[PDB]
Scaffold this active site. Structure first.
Site, mmCIF file in Angstrom:
data_model
loop_
_atom_site.group_PDB
_atom_site.id
_atom_site.type_symbol
_atom_site.label_atom_id
_atom_site.label_comp_id
_atom_site.label_asym_id
_atom_site.label_seq_id
_atom_site.Cartn_x
_atom_site.Cartn_y
_atom_site.Cartn_z
ATOM 1 N N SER A 102 34.089 44.138 -12.722
ATOM 2 C CA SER A 102 32.861 43.495 -13.174
ATOM 3 C C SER A 102 32.972 42.826 -14.536
ATOM 4 O O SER A 102 33.626 43.345 -15.451
ATOM 5 C CB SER A 102 31.730 44.516 -13.182
ATOM 6 O OG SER A 102 31.483 44.906 -11.839
ATOM 7 N N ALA A 154 30.693 42.155 -9.709
ATOM 8 C CA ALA A 154 29.513 41.550 -10.303
ATOM 9 C C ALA A 154 29.829 40.958 -11.671
ATOM 10 O O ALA A 154 30.616 41.506 -12.441
ATOM 11 C CB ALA A 154 28.381 42.584 -10.399
ATOM 12 N N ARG A 187 0.798 -1.240 0.000
ATOM 13 C CA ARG A 187 0.000 0.000 0.000
ATOM 14 C C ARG A 187 0.836 1.300 0.000
ATOM 15 O O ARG A 187 0.275 2.397 -0.016
ATOM 16 C CB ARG A 187 -0.971 -0.026 1.170
ATOM 17 C CG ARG A 187 -1.986 -1.171 1.076
ATOM 18 C CD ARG A 187 -3.294 -0.770 0.440
ATOM 19 N NE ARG A 187 -4.057 -1.912 -0.070
ATOM 20 C CZ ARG A 187 -5.307 -1.845 -0.533
ATOM 21 N NH1 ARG A 187 -5.963 -0.687 -0.555
ATOM 22 N NH2 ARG A 187 -5.911 -2.945 -0.973
ATOM 23 N N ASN A 197 1.531 1.888 7.278
ATOM 24 C CA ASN A 197 1.176 0.961 6.202
ATOM 25 C C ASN A 197 1.086 1.647 4.834
ATOM 26 O O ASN A 197 1.166 0.995 3.788
ATOM 27 C CB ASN A 197 -0.160 0.277 6.511
ATOM 28 C CG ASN A 197 -0.074 -0.688 7.688
ATOM 29 O OD1 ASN A 197 0.965 -1.299 7.930
ATOM 30 N ND2 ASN A 197 -1.190 -0.850 8.405
ATOM 31 N N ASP A 242 8.512 -0.821 10.669
ATOM 32 C CA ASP A 242 7.510 0.142 10.187
ATOM 33 C C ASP A 242 6.832 0.937 11.307
ATOM 34 O O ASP A 242 5.873 1.670 11.049
ATOM 35 C CB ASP A 242 6.461 -0.548 9.290
ATOM 36 C CG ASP A 242 5.607 -1.581 10.025
ATOM 37 O OD1 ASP A 242 5.755 -1.766 11.251
ATOM 38 O OD2 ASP A 242 4.733 -2.256 9.434
HETATM 39 C C1 LIG Z 1 -0.629 -11.540 14.136
HETATM 40 C C2 LIG Z 1 -0.020 -10.237 14.585
HETATM 41 O O1 LIG Z 1 1.160 -10.156 14.912
HETATM 42 N N1 LIG Z 1 -0.851 -9.195 14.618
HETATM 43 C C3 LIG Z 1 -0.431 -7.867 15.070
HETATM 44 C C4 LIG Z 1 -0.037 -7.080 13.818
HETATM 45 O O2 LIG Z 1 -1.085 -7.104 12.851
HETATM 46 P P1 LIG Z 1 -0.803 -6.851 11.286
HETATM 47 O O3 LIG Z 1 -2.047 -7.267 10.543
HETATM 48 O O4 LIG Z 1 -0.206 -5.489 11.077
HETATM 49 O O5 LIG Z 1 0.318 -7.967 11.080
HETATM 50 P P2 LIG Z 1 1.311 -8.065 9.833
HETATM 51 O O6 LIG Z 1 1.153 -9.472 9.348
HETATM 52 O O7 LIG Z 1 1.199 -6.875 8.917
HETATM 53 O O8 LIG Z 1 2.755 -7.973 10.531
HETATM 54 C C5 LIG Z 1 3.204 -6.863 11.303
HETATM 55 C C6 LIG Z 1 4.601 -6.486 10.834
HETATM 56 O O9 LIG Z 1 5.494 -7.620 10.854
HETATM 57 C C7 LIG Z 1 5.986 -7.865 9.537
HETATM 58 N N2 LIG Z 1 5.986 -9.279 9.174
HETATM 59 C C8 LIG Z 1 4.929 -10.000 9.254
HETATM 60 C C9 LIG Z 1 4.912 -11.311 8.952
HETATM 61 C C10 LIG Z 1 6.032 -11.975 8.585
HETATM 62 O O10 LIG Z 1 5.998 -13.267 8.287
HETATM 63 N N3 LIG Z 1 7.165 -11.304 8.489
HETATM 64 C C11 LIG Z 1 7.249 -9.952 8.969
HETATM 65 O O11 LIG Z 1 8.473 -9.310 8.700
HETATM 66 C C12 LIG Z 1 5.013 -7.151 8.591
HETATM 67 O O12 LIG Z 1 5.607 -6.772 7.362
HETATM 68 C C13 LIG Z 1 4.570 -5.970 9.408
HETATM 69 O O13 LIG Z 1 5.483 -4.898 9.265
HETATM 70 O O14 LIG Z 1 0.186 -5.698 14.054
HETATM 71 C C14 LIG Z 1 -0.567 -4.997 15.039
HETATM 72 C C15 LIG Z 1 0.223 -3.790 15.512
HETATM 73 O O15 LIG Z 1 0.041 -2.856 14.450
HETATM 74 C C16 LIG Z 1 -1.382 -5.773 16.080
HETATM 75 O O16 LIG Z 1 -2.562 -5.078 16.428
HETATM 76 C C17 LIG Z 1 -1.637 -7.229 15.732
HETATM 77 O O17 LIG Z 1 -2.045 -7.917 16.899
#
Ligand SMILES: CC(=O)N[C@H]1[C@@H](OP(=O)(O)OP(=O)(O)OC[C@H]2O[C@@H](n3ccc(=O)[nH]c3=O)[C@H](O)[C@@H]2O)O[C@H](CO)[C@@H](O)[C@@H]1O
Ligand SMILES: CC(=O)N[C@H]1[C@@H](OP(=O)(O)OP(=O)(O)OC[C@H]2O[C@@H](n3ccc(=O)[nH]c3=O)[C@H](O)[C@@H]2O)O[C@H](CO)[C@@H](O)[C@@H]1O
Ligand SMILES: CC(=O)N[C@H]1[C@@H](OP(=O)(O)OP(=O)(O)OC[C@H]2O[C@@H](n3ccc(=O)[nH]c3=O)[C@H](O)[C@@H]2O)O[C@H](CO)[C@@H](O)[C@@H]1O
Lengths: 450, 450, 450
Positions: free
Chosen positions: B402, B377, B15, B224, B102
């Site tokens: 100049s 100048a 996104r 995000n 992030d």
């Molecule tokens: C299951 C979980 O943890 N959920 C949490 C997650 O949800 P959310 O839906 O944001 O969980 P994501 O799967 O996006 O993962 C969070 C972060 O970890 C990174 N990433 C994820 C998976 C992976 O295999 N590798 C990895 O590097 C993602 O890119 C992201 O930056 O974020 C929130 C904080 O904003 C919380 O409210 C949620 O409880």
């Protein structure tokens, strides 16, 4: 009743981390204390007693022209001690308003309401409700009526929860001030003579104390540090911009506009984002100012367009002129009607007559240029390596070719024509054409790197 | 107890609509993930395990100098799977804090509070109350105690009304992490191994789970998309500006100030609206920066005024110098004390000695200029159409008239004087005056159009 | 059902203090009324009846190209009287939406909801809850249902406390409009025919009146003065910036960004603070725009960097070009791929071929420049003092030495080399080297002041 003012202004302002005293830091380009002096004057104060101390020499140089009674407080022994330095000048039957040089936004209207609310032989004070009242004197009320102020360092746990606080601003008659100030001691946690003890002293005399609650919190805010000062600046600039908008000035974004002085304006004036207006500026009808411009002490006629990133100071511009973008007018620049000044052009202490154009990459200094002249790109007025700096005088209807140097002192009469690349050291006569004779070598078959 | 950190940073960031991976988008001129690595280091992390995946090559080039353990997650199978990639390096008796590349604004202070709140053999997590908690894991409490986290896609209608949500940030000991990660499955609506299942697993082991509620919502916010990123940027810039204001820097409007690096400052520094400070910048006492200036990697001495719309990079400016407006200092510009550089002047890889002036419409490159010179100048340093670019050396007390072209390589010795409009190709000796001989034709009675 | 629109736009706008009529004041660079006409068109209006009056001549010149039915209201006798001027064109079985040219932010989506909510033979109106409803018609509800609107000047003390107010916007079928407008009188405190009386008239006919409460207050706000207009401008610019951010454009600060037209963009575009985009602008992938830039009607190719304080209009820039800082592109500037334009350079109505550089203090106008040319600092294209303005044609791989004047009309063929300080009046041939022969006087032992 008559009125005089006392302005407390002796503070060091340690948390400004500055070599200036507290009250000389500026809002909208002038010292905070100057805003307060001006308000006291508009209120109709007969005398304005300025209590000063720290940075005394700087106070006197920066405020040399202010119509005030200079009252030196050699030691800062408390707010009551400060006011007492002025007390011998109080008339018994005038009202005295206490103000602070570090609280610059207090308005004439609020102070008139405060003065009107003062009961005979009593006190009116300005209070304000704060979510976080830490640091401020708490207003103590019994059965709805104000009976005391208790400072932060003297307050018990319950009193610290009080959200109504003292702004410091109060009004009483001169006789009552003298009476109560003499009865103020310094038996408290700071060892200071508190002006705030006047409330409880008045209550002890069965005299009435009325609090006027200020509804605009920023209006009564003081600045102890530059973060607070910046908050005051933004509030003040928003207020100024809002006034101008209601008067019919199109300010594209009031949050990106700064006025540091006075603006006189006509109708249908348009000011784009990030413009700074300094000193005394006058704009005629239908003036348009592009983004990024800085105007300081200028008069701009009707129908002038100033294009982006132009900086103008101590200059006059006639009607229907066009300036910018990237134009620089330095002090003494006077542009007649229907003139054109263009990008990367600097004009200093010069007059430019009606219809004349100076459109690119040019410096004109100490010059008089007539009407309907064409000043080419790259033209420069310069001097010999001498002492003082002499004048270039150009008549009407003169063409000055590109990249010409005009070496002052020199005169170019009406109707003259000067070729590009010329060095003018001798006077040019009426309808004289001056062309440079160049010698060139031509080399054939010259191959540049392949 | 010791501490190490794991930073999840493997995401594509769809996104953001970018060719960069999610965590390399910048805040204050550096990748979000760099802010997080720096915080983990200040917290005292012994190891920092960086979980990376998408845009792997770009991560390694942009973060080549970061003191981290590079842990490649070939497939993004859930937050638990990510942490498990680092789990073999966890020491049993160190604490491990889980952070996200992030979510760049999390502070050392908040994380120290979180770590202190962790119960032995249990978990501490950071939570936050949101008006709109859509998207986030909901905190499930029974009798006041946290017993589970339920993700948005797994939650029933009642659980979606819960306003307390998971920030993702948690701390537990290395042994407990290994234990619980091995018991995480992927039987849920996303088919992922959820790190959030550790809360319910800990509850199943009769181990304690403590939530620390963050009071500053923006501090724990992730980005995000670029709209969220811009909100983080503004929050961060406001925080930086507020710190500088409290330190005694006069920033006229903190909402129109940007710092993208580090600022060292003296006292009574004044910075007008719309200034950008980039890289490592040092400002001495009483430096004044006008509106619109850009300073990148510069050292500015005491009492320097930089006038509006000046752009300076990789340059040094000595005390009491005056620069601008509309001045350009390119890398390697070194201006001595009491120098003057004016409008539409570009200086590149050149030294300019004490008291010298270069005030208009001039280019000086690859030059050494001595003290008390007057660079007129329209002066330009240039080269032959050759290969590399040679030097112009000007001594002390030289006047350059100049519109003179200085054709490198060339030397002009002390005290020399060069007339306007000159082309200098040969070395000029000490106290040598060089004047151009011009030939002109004068034609009288030349009438321009009437 | 079909739909047509009526836009009330006849007002003088006294509190704008302007020579323009109320609805021609701009938001995002176009008249408020143009925003409303555009919305009515997107909604699918078959006819758009524009009710005009004050500043009639100006309305017709500024809106000459708008697809509307021009309905002149010679006297402003009330909102019902205005709509009645268009009523003879209403089809009995189409819906008619009433809109206002001074309320420019109303969206297609809100109006579609309003239209959908209209009951057969009844009325739908848009209302809004305000903390301060002073000035606006109050919504009168009995047993939850809307039965009347009472204007501020006609309302009793109790009715003035009502916080739900009329936005003015309503929808009914053409036949019902004709029926009810004929029964509107002017027996009220203003002596006007109120459109608002339609609500009570509909209730008298046992026809249903449904209010749709608008949830975004600014969306339905009108501008009576320039302060209100500025509030609308800021709201609109924030909305535009938010859309661009969600589309993947990095806008460093959405509060310091202005779009006054349309922006087409690629991916990974970065726009620094204080940029203004005007007219129709297209930016390719990975375009970076530095602080302070103004782009009006330009096409910028992939991978172009525009450095700070560049102003570009009616220009095309090819891929991988580098522009700025302090560059000026005037209409007709066409820069090929991999070109370089630098500080204090102005290009007007000229083409510049691939790889060419124009890096300092130069004016190029009415010129064609080929590929891989080196245009030196201080170069100027100029003309004789004649009538019209002729062309300079420079071929490929030409070196033009610093401070050269190119006097049009003139041609310089491929591979030519021109020395610094030259005045070119005659055509230069292929691989011709032209060097100026200077004569100088050298005076030894010339002592400048000590
Ligand atoms: C299951 C979980 O943890 N959920 C949490 C997650 O949800 P959310 O839906 O944001 O969980 P994501 O799967 O996006 O993962 C969070 C972060 O970890 C990174 N990433 C994820 C998976 C992976 O295999 N590798 C990895 O590097 C993602 O890119 C992201 O930056 O974020 C929130 C904080 O904003 C919380 O409210 C949620 O409880
Ligand atoms: C005892 C007193 O009055 N307290 C008031 C004061 O507290 P506060 O703690 O601010 O009182 P300070 O002692 O700072 O004095 C207020 C102002 O008067 C000046 N100054 C002070 C002492 C002096 O001998 N000379 C003088 O010129 C200070 O520099 C300052 O500008 O300000 C508040 C308004 O913000 C109130 O809530 C407090 O009730
Ligand atoms: C009687 C009426 O409708 N009142 C509504 C009107 O009040 P308000 O007092 O704003 O009504 P105005 O008379 O200003 O008319 C509204 C708009 O219609 C235009 N105009 C008006 C009269 C006319 O003969 N010709 C015409 O072109 C005006 O210039 C203005 O732009 O606006 C509000 C929405 O802001 C509502 O709360 C009021 O219920």
């Amino acid at each position: 009743k008559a009125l005089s003012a006392v302005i407390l202004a002796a503070g060091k302002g340690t948390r400004m981390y500055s070599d200036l005293p507290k009250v000389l830091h500026t809002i909208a380009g002038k010292p905070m204390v100057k805003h307060v002096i001006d308000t006291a004057h508009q209120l109709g104060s007969e005398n304005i007693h300025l209590i000063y101390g720290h940075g005394g020499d700087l106070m006197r140089t920066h405020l040399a022209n202010e119509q005030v009674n200079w009252v030196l407080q050699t030691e800062q022994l408390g707010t009551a001690h400060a006011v007492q330095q002025a007390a011998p000048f109080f008339k018994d039957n005038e009202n005295i308003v206490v103000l602070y040089g570090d609280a610059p936004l207090i308005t004439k209207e609020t102070l008139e309401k405060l003065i009107e609310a003062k009961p005979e032989n009593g006190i009116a004070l300005l209070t304000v409700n704060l979510d976080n009242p830490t640091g401020y004197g708490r207003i103590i009320r019994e059965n709805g009526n104000v009976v005391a102020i208790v400072e932060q360092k003297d307050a018990n746990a319950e009193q610290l929860n009080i959200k109504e606080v003292n702004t410091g601003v109060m009004v009483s008659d001169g006789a009552s001030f003298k009476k109560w100030l003499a009865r103020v001691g310094n038996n408290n946690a700071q060892g200071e003579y508190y002006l705030t003890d006047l409330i409880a002293l008045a209550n002890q005399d069965n005299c009435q104390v009325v609090a006027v609650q200020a509804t605009d919190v920023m209006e009564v805010e003081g600045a102890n540090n530059r973060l607070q000062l910046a908050a005051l600046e933004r509030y003040f600039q928003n207020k100024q911009a809002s006034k101008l908008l209601l008067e019919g000035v199109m300010i594209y974004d009031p949050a990106r506009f700064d006025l540091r002085g006075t603006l006189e304006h006509g109708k249908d004036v348009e000011i784009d984002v990030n413009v700074i207006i300094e000193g005394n500026v006058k704009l005629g009808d239908r003036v348009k100012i592009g983004t990024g411009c800085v105007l300081k002490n200028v008069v701009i006629g009707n129908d002038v367009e100033i294009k982006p990133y132009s900086v103008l100071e101590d200059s006059i511009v006639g009607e229907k002129a066009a300036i910018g973008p990237f134009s620089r007018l330095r002090p003494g620049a006077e542009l007649a009607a229907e003139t054109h000044v263009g990008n990367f052009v600097e004009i200093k202490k010069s007059t430019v007559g009606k219809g004349s154009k100076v459109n690119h990459l040019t410096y004109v200094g100490d010059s008089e240029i007539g009407s309907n002249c064409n000043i080419g790109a790259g033209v420069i007025t310069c001097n010999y390596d001498g002492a003082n700096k002499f004048k270039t005088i150009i008549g009407d209807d003169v063409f000055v070719g590109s990249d010409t140097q005009l070496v002052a002192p020199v005169k170019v009469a009406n109707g003259a024509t000067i070729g590009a690349g010329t060095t003018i050291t001798r006077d040019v006569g009426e309808n004289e054409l001056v062309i440079t004779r160049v010698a060139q070598r031509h080399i054939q078959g010259w191959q540049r790197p392949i």
